[PDB]
Amino acid sequence: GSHMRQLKIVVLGDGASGKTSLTTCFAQETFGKQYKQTIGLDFFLRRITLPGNLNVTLQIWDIGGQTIGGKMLDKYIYGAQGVLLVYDITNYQSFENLEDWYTVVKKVSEESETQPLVALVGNKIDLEHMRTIKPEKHLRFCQENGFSSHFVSAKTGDSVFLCFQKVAAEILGIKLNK
Numbered sequence: 001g002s003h004m005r006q007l008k009i010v011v012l013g014d015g016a017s018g019k020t021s022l023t024t025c026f027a028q029e030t031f032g033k034q035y036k037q038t039i040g041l042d043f044f045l046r047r048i049t050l051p052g053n054l055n056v057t058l059q060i061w062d063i064g065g066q067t068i069g070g071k072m073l074d075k076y077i078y079g080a081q082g083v084l085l086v087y088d089i090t091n092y093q094s095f096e097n098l099e100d101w102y103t104v105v106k107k108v109s110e111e112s113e114t115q116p117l118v119a120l121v122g123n124k125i126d127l128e129h130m131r132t133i134k135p136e137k138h139l140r141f142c143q144e145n146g147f148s149s150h151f152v153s154a155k156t157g158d159s160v161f162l163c164f165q166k167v168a169a170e171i172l173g174i175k176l177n178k
């Protein structure tokens with residue numbers, strides 16, 4: 001027998017960073033019958049084919065309005081093979097607070113004996129000329145913790161598909177060459 005290959009990715013970060021915009025931007029290609037199959041659930045599914053004709057379904061979880069201490073947060077983070085730490089490049093506190101989001105991820109990782117792929121996602125790159133987190137500051141946070149680095153715009157779609165695709169590939173031990 002052979003079963004579906006599914007990877008769970010959770011999207012974390014402070015309110016107003018663009019988490020729901022980001023997840024929706026990636027979900028849009030599935031709108032119609034497939035997205036409707038999980039309407040009102042905690043996640044949606046999107047199938048991608050990674051290089052080498054590797055079919056995988058991504059199960060993408062938006063935490064909604066959950067805060068760091070939310071007692072529902074566990075179902076989002078436990079089992080997550082990929083984690084997006086999302087901030088708004090124009091909102092400094094959203095970046096600073098990612099240390100605290102990452103503390104929860106480390107705690108879950110240690111308990112679960114897992115090593116999820118963690119991506120730092122600077123959203124709103126369409127607003128680059130008004131950013132309050134410089135690229136160098138973002139890349140320092142990535143270097144300190146081994147995060148995958150992404151600058152995206154959920155509004156316009158810039159780099160969004162590639163962020164999820166790269167995270168999926170890295171979960172499976174593949175560095176995509178582009």
Ligand SMILES: Nc1nc2c(ncn2[C@@H]2O[C@H](COP(=O)(O)OP(=O)(O)O)[C@@H](OP(=O)(O)O)[C@H]2O)c(=O)[nH]1
Pocket residue numbers: 013014015016017018019020021022064123124125126127152153154155156
């Ligand atoms: N310029 C820009 N704005 C973005 C981007 N991503 C999200 N936004 C805006 O940021 C606001 C918060 O987005 P949302 O997806 O609800 O964030 P959240 O789910 O993290 O709370 C929304 O504004 P509104 O209240 O206007 O809808 C949304 O339109 C982006 O890449 N660029």
Ligand SMILES: [Mg+2]
Pocket residue numbers: 019020021064065
């Ligand atoms: Mg939201």
